[PDB]
Amino acid sequence: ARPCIPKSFGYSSVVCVCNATYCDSFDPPTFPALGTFSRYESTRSGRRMELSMGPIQANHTGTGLLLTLQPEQKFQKVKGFGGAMTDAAALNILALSPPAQNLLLKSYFSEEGIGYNIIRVPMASCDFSIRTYTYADTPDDFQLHNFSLPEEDTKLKIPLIHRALQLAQRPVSLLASPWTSPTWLKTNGAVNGKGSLKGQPGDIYHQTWARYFVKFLDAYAEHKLQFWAVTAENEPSAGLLSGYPFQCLGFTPEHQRDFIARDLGPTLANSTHHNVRLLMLDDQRLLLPHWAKVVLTDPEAAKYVHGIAVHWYLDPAKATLGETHRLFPNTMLFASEACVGSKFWEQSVRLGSWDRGMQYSHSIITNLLYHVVGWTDWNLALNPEGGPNWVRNFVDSPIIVDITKDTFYKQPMFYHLGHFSKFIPEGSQRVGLVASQKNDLDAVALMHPDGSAVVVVLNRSSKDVPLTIKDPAVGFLETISPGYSIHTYLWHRQ
Numbered sequence: 084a085r086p087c088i089p090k091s092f093g094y095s096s097v098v099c100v101c102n103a104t105y106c107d108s109f110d111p112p113t114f115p116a117l118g119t120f121s122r123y124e125s126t127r128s129g130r131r132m133e134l135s136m137g138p139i140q141a142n143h144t145g146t147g148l149l150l151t152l153q154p155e156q157k158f159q160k161v162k163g164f165g166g167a168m169t170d171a172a173a174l175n176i177l178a179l180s181p182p183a184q185n186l187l188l189k190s191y192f193s194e195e196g197i198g199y200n201i202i203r204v205p206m207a208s209c210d211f212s213i214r215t216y217t218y219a220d221t222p223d224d225f226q227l228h229n230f231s232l233p234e235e236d237t238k239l240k241i242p243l244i245h246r247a248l249q250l251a252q253r254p255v256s257l258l259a260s261p262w263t264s265p266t267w268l269k270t271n272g273a274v275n276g277k278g279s280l281k282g283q284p285g286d287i288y289h290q291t292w293a294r295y296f297v298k299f300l301d302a303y304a305e306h307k308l309q310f311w312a313v314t315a316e317n318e319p320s321a322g323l324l325s326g327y328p329f330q331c332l333g334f335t336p337e338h339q340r341d342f343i344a345r346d347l348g349p350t351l352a353n354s355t356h357h358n359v360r361l362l363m364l365d366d367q368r369l370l371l372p373h374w375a376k377v378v379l380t381d382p383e384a385a386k387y388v389h390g391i392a393v394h395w396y397l398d399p400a401k402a403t404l405g406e407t408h409r410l411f412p413n414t415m416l417f418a419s420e421a422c423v424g425s426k427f428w429e430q431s432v433r434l435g436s437w438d439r440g441m442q443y444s445h446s447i448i449t450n451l452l453y454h455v456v457g458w459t460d461w462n463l464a465l466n467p468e469g470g471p472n473w474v475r476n477f478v479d480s481p482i483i484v485d486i487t488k489d490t491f492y493k494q495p496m497f498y499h500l501g502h503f504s505k506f507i508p509e510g511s512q513r514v515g516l517v518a519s520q521k522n523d524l525d526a527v528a529l530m531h532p533d534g535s536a537v538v539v540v541l542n543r544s545s546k547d548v549p550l551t552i553k554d555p556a557v558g559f560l561e562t563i564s565p566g567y568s569i570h571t572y573l574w575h576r577q
């Protein structure tokens with residue numbers, strides 16, 4: 084284990100400084116002995132996923148907050164956690180020296196880091212690109228004879244994805260999402276602005292666009308990368324707005340329904356990539372449950388849709404995620420994009436912001452309490468400006484690269500995400516956790532495939548909160564949630 088080298092940039096907490104020869108890392112994972120629990124702690128005062136162990140007590144008395152595990156109350160199974168390999172992310176990582184690159188990828192993907200098992204891959208360019216390109220920019224190439232991957236894929240994204248997968252012990256799932264089609268498939272003839280596919284679902288424009296998905300998967304497969312899932316479109320509601328400033332492709336819910344039923348569903352199903360899952364929406368949860376009702380009440384669309392992808396930017400959970408699970412319980416919910424830097428009076432990048440850390444962990448807990456099976460960050464890494472970004476739509480990122488110093492900074496967001504991603508493997512099942520009294524804490528409980536327990540407790544208040552966790556199988560965990568802390572608790576149940 085190597086500890087955090089802390090540095091202040093004058094905000095509420097510290098970043099952890101990494102370079103070619105040093106980065107903070109964990110010892111290999113270990114399980115706590117029966118009758119004991121593991122605790123990982125991070126605090127605004129500067130602790131970073133510090134390991135301690137305590138006893139599970141047979142007895143408890145007190146008028147103090149009790150959280151009772153309900154292990155027979157079973158909810159969703161977890162797909163996983165990760166982030167986006169954008170052009171911006173890959174360019175920033177590959178601008179470091181090779182040893183610094185390896186420590187950055189280990190921080191995310193190694194069991195000595197926080198065990199990411201999802202990578203979202205943009206299909207061609209997005210705002211976090213230094214140019215606009217698609218894979219098929221030759222006008223009216225309906226046969227896609229000039230489809231090809233540019234250097235952004237072959238020299239940046241694909242080589243970094245191979246290295247990430249080599250470092251991970253857990254199987255990693257790839258998720259692909261397009262922002263725009265070629266401009267000659269669009270009513271407005273531009274990568275951005277208000278515009279949808281030309282013509283009507285079933286026609287040559289819609290079939291060419293579906294075949295573009297298959298050509299993408301074929302080209303990644305030639306580079307020995309297979310996808311878990313694709314989204315029908317990134318933020319389809321964006322291409323309905325006049326002057327939308329970056330790459331988009333408009334779909335109404337009806338157009339998405341008909342595209343999936345007539346074109347994308349059948350084209351994928353008849354391909355060698357038929358096992359790739361299709362996720363719908365990939366947009367703000369404020370569009371639910373209306374979007375899910377329009378798409379999934381059509382059986383010709385619903386038979387092709389594995390899940391609903393949601394974005395965390397503009398966020399009420401029960402009315403959107405809850406109602407959607409109730410209508411469509413067998414269609415998984417998955418958080419496919421989250422970020423901060425939206426605050427008009429704050430910088431895009433706030434090095435050492437504890438507030439932005441708490442925003443991530445709060446969002447993940449809310450998501451897990453409303454059926455969401457996975458949580459996917461945006462850019463894996465940005466520069467101190469929050470770029471590059473060709474429209475200056477700069478945002479924050481858990482890792483900030485300083486190319487002039489061959490240095491990268493691990494933000495509180497990195498550790499807040501780690502409290503979940505490191506300790507909740509694929510197949511973990513959320514279970515019940517009931518509080519004995521109204522409290523200011525956020526908490527969630529899950530059970531590992533092997534039967535062991537994990538609880539995360541976030542305290543976004545300034546006040547220390549004493550609490551006990553009861554598991555009827557083993558007894559009582561007596562602990563304290565310090566103000567501006569996050570804890571992960573792990574224990575074997577037999």
Ligand SMILES: *[C@@H]1O[C@H](CO)[C@@H](O[C@@H]2O[C@H](CO)[C@@H](O)[C@H](O)[C@H]2NC(C)=O)[C@H](O)[C@H]1NC(C)=O
Pocket residue numbers: 088101102103104105
């Ligand atoms: C990379 O970061 C490490 C750790 O912060 C730097 O190593 C420290 O160097 C200082 C020299 O001022 C020593 O006093 C410390 O003992 C070192 N710590 C450790 C753990 O070795 C290292 O110098 C940095 N590399 C570069 C190129 O700046």
Ligand SMILES: *[C@@H]1[C@H](O)[C@@H](O)[C@H](O)[C@@H](CO)[C@H]1NC(=O)CCCC
Pocket residue numbers: 209210211317318394395396397420422461476478
């Ligand atoms: C999600 C977008 O797909 C991504 O391209 C953006 O970079 C990121 C930050 O703006 C996210 N944006 C949103 O969720 C809403 C954008 C409205 C202008």
Ligand SMILES: *[C@@H]1O[C@H](CO)[C@@H](O)[C@H](O)[C@H]1NC(C)=O
Pocket residue numbers: 221228229
């Ligand atoms: C389109 O494809 C043809 C045939 O392979 C090729 O000769 C031409 O250079 C391509 N045009 C591009 C890449 O702009």
Ligand SMILES: *[C@@H]1O[C@H](CO)[C@@H](O)[C@H](O)[C@H]1NC(C)=O
Pocket residue numbers: 353
């Ligand atoms: C479905 O796939 C088969 C075999 O690859 C192909 O011959 C056929 O043309 C496809 N179906 C249609 C209607 O194109």
